[PDB]
Amino acid sequence: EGVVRLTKDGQRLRNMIMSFNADIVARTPKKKPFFWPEQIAGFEHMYDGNDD
């Protein structure tokens, strides 16, 4: 046995956890408000993201 045989499990688990967390970062929808379509009827352009 060398030196990289006994660290395989921990390294694989580290890689899997980092991959799962990257998936969480990428595919999770961000924080946006919950609006009824009738609450903002005619006001849709106000919440686009502009600062006008």
Added chain:
Amino acid sequence: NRLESILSRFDADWTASDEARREAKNDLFFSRVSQWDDWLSQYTTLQYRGQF
């Protein structure tokens, strides 16, 4: 005869030190092959078994 005496002596010595032999063999296997001493659970069900 000689054969019977030799086998009797060997059997006495083997049986006297059985438990120490088994414990030392386990220590060798644990520190050289793997720390999951599962003779059974080889087809029971495949579950994660880390080596840390």
